């Protein structure tokens, strides 16, 4: 999980 958003979301 990922994408242009390494942490949670």
């Known amino acids: 999980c ?3 958003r390494g ?3």
């Open 2 to 4: 990922g994408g242009i």
């Open 7 to 9: 942490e949670r979301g």
